[PDB]
Amino acid sequence: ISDTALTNELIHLLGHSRHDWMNKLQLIKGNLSLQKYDRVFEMIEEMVIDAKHESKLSNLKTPHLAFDFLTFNWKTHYMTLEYEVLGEIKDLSAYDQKLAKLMRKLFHLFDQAVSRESENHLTVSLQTDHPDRQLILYLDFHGAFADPSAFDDIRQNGYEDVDIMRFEITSHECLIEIGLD
């Protein structure tokens, strides 16, 4: 397996993953010391569910979207991503780029709307089992907006052939339901 730049890139990403796990071992041994054995167990399970989703996402034959979500927090953004896959695993390869692209657009609208003092969190949920649509996207955000007026264009005027079903935005939260066909 080669190309020295590419090789340097994987080595680098595996290094990020490493830190994440070390932080987790930090939460594990930290409580492990304060003798809170029921939290440690609690955490571990949360860990197994995040890992459980990462997997699923890595099995939708949608590599460009998976790579974006798995690396998003390893880049200098102003919010953290938590994603989950609702429904069984399907072959959404016919949707990879559409999604990947749509997410890029929503992703920076956010990184140009969120305050930078607030602890910003964004949860994206990819549903593969809807009865009427082939795929709906849910985005739940909590934090602070500096330029909330940035979501304007996409509010009145949507984005491509994606039915933006709902888009609510309050003081510190933002809800978006986008459907795909």
Binding site: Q26, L27, K29, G30, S33, L34, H77, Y78, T80
Partner: protein, 119 residues
Amino acid sequence: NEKILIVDDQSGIRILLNEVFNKEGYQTFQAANGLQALDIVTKERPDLVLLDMKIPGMDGIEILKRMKVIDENIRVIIMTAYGELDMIQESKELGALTHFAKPFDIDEIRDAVKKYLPL
């Protein structure tokens, strides 16, 4: 009356470290990014600051400076990922005490912040 500021982007550890000192007679101040940390340094003027160096959005090494442009007396202990030797130096070369690579033993942090900040 000894002030300590915790600055990590992960709640868990932030809550953890808190409860830790939240025990040894220390008034503790939390924070999730550099922009918030300053304001606290600026407003409540902490004694020691344990600063996470790899927080998305912040150049700890940058807020490290700022933090000193506000009170150089500032006693800052950096929490790092193991192997970031240059960041550690540049930092200790900016005015910090000693790095602590994660996952650090929960023991020696209270210990070490004691022999660094008697209460």
